[PDB]
Symmetry: C5
Subunit: 302 residues, 5 copies
């Protein structure tokens, strides 16, 4: 008596629908609509998302608002701090608050550093902070008399997010960057610390499916009655410096991500793709002209 | 007594059946035909494709119809667009609309670029777009005098499909390729953005099996009662520059990939292999003279 | 629910297998137990949990399946100078196999050298070899050859050595494009050369459900053909190693079950059989050093 | 069958965690809902589907679990010159931990150089160091030192730094055989240095069946000991990163269920505890930048 | 459906294990609880969910299993000059094992260097060694040795060092084809050298269904032999490390269950045992630094 009902669905795009480079920000959404009912009224069903493919989409790599970076210059002779300046990303950011290239994250940190040294260090001893495309690691390029005279300072947010450099803590907030070579690099990639993207989610405002329990909407009370609809949640990881992506999800062996279907009598519902950031700020996945999206669902009877 | 019924099948080929280099384009198809009935009438069954092997077949690597590429050249001194041309693939394409080598995709982009430099730029400083066999990444080769004078422009389709270059957006369509060295290469492979092949499916016109639910045929309306018989969905990924492949599948992941058998009394049925492109255009998997195809089905009783 | 486990092993020696396995003794075990294995009141499924074929020999190539031909194309006259079949007969064992991809490379080389005996000077004769390091075939050439001529591969050579760069001239032959002294394959193609498809465990006398097979006949489609298979392991040739240690362990998503039809037995045979891509089955044979391990599960329903 | 999902998060900041996580705030969450979570008619299993410990600091070394000693052996006189315990006192935090293998190397070195200063000249004093790039420890020496002397490692040093080649002179000490100026480990041994074994989710108040534990008594065997564990993540230190982002997802082992004993509840606590290899348990703590995510599944039966 | 989890650990030290594990104390634990573990009215399966054997020492080679012989062949005379069997006696520990592939290389090298003593000049003696970096054995030779002579491997050597290029002259012996100074294996063959087959958890007194085993005596094939195995871990030697840290974690949907026959018990013993390819059984033993972890599941039906 076990029944398997498979529902495929797709989304084509174009320049008229999405605008140049996805300027219109059209959310990825699909209206499933059929002439008859999908499920039998005698049976109880579970819903699982078997697969999806988000082919040719754009995702942000950095979100300055979440971070509070600061750089500084220390002196060896006087043994005191020369200055401290916050990293200003304002010129590099798009309207929605995001950046799309770790070269630009590296550039912004460099301009803050070069600007801080303007009065106090000579031109050819100004250290350069940059992002290497090959190794996916940030590097610090320095002269030998700079290393003898001064140190570069990172505050705790810079310390943590660029953790694979070598550090020597001077106080509660600031740390010195230990530099022995002309070109010093990270021991390891830390791009996972910089990406704002946490999860990608499929939701539905009208599908009669059992909600997931959530914590309190407010920041105050532990007590909560809050719920939400989630059909699958895919954990996103940023392996490299590619803002343009092609994301394949295929359910594996265990396939534990089931949700109860509450009402059998329906022929219509909406599905949407939503991106959650690490700060829990929600925003929709948007189409490019060249985006194709595939989706496969399974309604399984019990 | 739960029952496992296993069904094996193979296709050998030759030069008479398939034609030279598979000229005849005979679809991969099998008629399973047996003496007595395959299943018991007293039981209900699920069908799952345990394993297949597409041994020595050919697959296309690129499909120019779906892409609208344009290159261009931007002068720094005048600070204006000098020329723009569409990339023409007509001289590289086979009967069905496909190409079979990423070198040729590189060459086509190169000749477009050379043709656009014909009148305006001197012969020694003409840039060379190419495909590196060793790294699976496309490269742009340039002289120092060219980089001081001019830029290479990619439109939004080029931008997306060759995204791992460093870009600088000048306009709603075109973006500048930032070049700092003689030979500049992609920071990541983008062959996944070029392959027209999405899925490879096994289907049947006469097996009494439950249909999967499909989206609307008509462009205007969203409603649909469209259906189709799909026995398995193999997702394809282009790993390298190999048109000739040996494709193995074993069901270690898709525990859920079952289909209901509606009738128990059948004696014979057809199976055929079909390739779906990303534009959802259907075309059959075809034989070479050297093709061997293996296939294993499971009828599992409930 | 009942889980009944059954271990078996085959130690080998020079007296049982002969020197270099010259006796060709099939890998085979007779299980024989004092009482009945399964209790008569229950119904059972059989599954093969693991085996280990430790220290055995497998072939890497089988010339009979392939029809290789090489040729020389003159670029000046713009015509074919000659064509010859690749003969593997000096390289093959009694059973029809070869055991090293160096030898497969050597045989293609000697065919290519022989065809250039009268036509081209000694110094420009091209060399086709197998690299042990990269598992890729290579073509060594002089610059004088590359201007004058091209090497030709027929379609079987084209498909099996597909990762070279090719240019078709007619419906059978293709030109090998060569721009450097030492040109090599873009990717390994050993998967195209191995004859080994599957390794299987079968039984003459175990009361188990048979798998449905296609027709033995050359012409007709209709079939009542069947056969006993307890597991089938897909084999892939990763490198140039004829000697192998093959480990199989069942992953969690467990489908490879077979119905036991009769509970009343205390004795059965198991045999290991190799299947090739041309469907020709032959037995897995013992070496003196071979150890074989096996674990079966009888799981009740 | 019913699937009840429950998500939770912990945002953090400078005021909650303190500078560099100095306040040592345990990673903990109180769930609290207006209505009851589970239907009283049904029976449930609990499984932790996923968590993500994003931006946390973990120790890389814990001196109290080791007893390291270096020494010097003279080749000519063929006797032990001296021996000393490696002093980690200066390099350690309040809680007894270190966070960099560069500092583990430095501590071993200063003990080695302190033992040499009266009996070996400056030029020939060997340098023990950690290599950031290869993730392997190294010993830098002069040819004059190699011929005159040997470095001595005791058993604990011998085992934790096992990829150097060794020569046992007595039942405790071993000679480090050195041929080049810079000699390195044949393999990384960071897995032997980490104190972190498991990371666990526990709950004092959730009505879930306990896991059976052995006695806290070292001498006696008998035990009635128990504890609430909802999942246990095995941790592996691969590199020199104290700052981590740890992701768990139940693809591997969905056998990890615990019986819910009481359906009637709307409140419980979840905490993240770290267990070292000596079984010393301690709380996972927050940095200002930490974000923690958590997903539980109550599944009916 | 009930899930009963039982944890267990062994925290070693110098006094329990002895210096370098001198005391050869087997890895064994006694579970002993106040009340009965399982419910009397229910029926149970047992699965081992995970273990961790952290800081143990395993052997890499076992000479008694192999009969290695090298030889030398003259090109000019076209005959065998000499043959000698490879003696490992001077390298082997009390229990018949060796712990470094360098020493296996050295032992073959001395057997080779003793055979050349009277026959070949000092410079032209070939060197057999193990390359630590590549995990491959190597042969170093001079130009005039390759022109003058060949090295011979017998069939046992041929099979265990199969990655070299070979050429057979006789039912037992084969020639090692050497074209360059330093010649190496085309593939690693440490898997042909490890004597370790699997690591097993046993129990004398746990009331659990035994696994069915073959005959102890090789005379007859009939057998009523049985043995208690709770889990069965296949071991693979991937490098030259004798000191290891072995982690086992079960797959989501494993079949590796055993039937518990009696629910009325509160005590049992677990022990870790190593099985070799010759089926010889020996206990896993503690070092002072060893930590053992273990998690059982009893799952009701």
């Amino acid at each position: 008596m076990k029944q398997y009902i498979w529902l495929n669905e797709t989304i084509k795009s174009n320049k008229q629908l999405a605008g140049p480079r996805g300027s219109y920000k059209r959310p990825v959404s699909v209206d499933i609509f059929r002439s008859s009912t999908i499920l039998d009224p005698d049976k109880n069903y579970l819903l699982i998302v078997e697969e999806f493919h988000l082919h040719k989409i754009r995702l942000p790599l950095f979100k300055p608002a979440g971070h509070d970076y600061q750089v500084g210059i220390f002196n060896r002779s006087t043994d005191e701090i020369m200055g401290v300046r916050e990293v200003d990303f304002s010129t590099f950011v798009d309207e929605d608050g995001y950046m799309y290239d770790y070269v630009d994250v590296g550039t912004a940190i460099n301009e803050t550093l070069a600007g801080l040294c303007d009065g106090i260090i000579g031109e050819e001893d100004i250290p350069v902070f940059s992002f290497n495309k090959h190794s996916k690691k940030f590097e610090i390029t320095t002269t030998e008399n700079f290393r003898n005279g001064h140190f570069i300072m990172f505050n705790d947010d810079m310390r943590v997010d660029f953790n694979s450099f070598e550090f020597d803590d001077i106080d509660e907030e600031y740390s010195l960057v230990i530099l022995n070579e002309d070109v010093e690099t990270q021991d390891a990639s830390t791009l996972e610390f910089l990406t704002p993207i946490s999860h990608i989610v499929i939701e539905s405002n009208d599908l009669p499916v059992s909600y997931e329990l959530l914590p309190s909407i407010s920041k105050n009370t532990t007590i909560s009655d809050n719920t939400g609809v989630f059909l699958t949640n895919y954990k996103y990881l940023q392996q490299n410096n590619q803002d343009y992506n092609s994301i394949l999800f295929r359910v594996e062996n265990s396939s534990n991500k089931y949700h109860n279907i509450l009402q059998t009598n329906f022929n219509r519902f909406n599905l949407s793709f939503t991106i959650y950031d690490y700060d829990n700020e929600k925003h929709p996945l948007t189409l490019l002209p060249q985006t194709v999206i595939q989706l496969k669902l399974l309604f399984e009877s019990i």
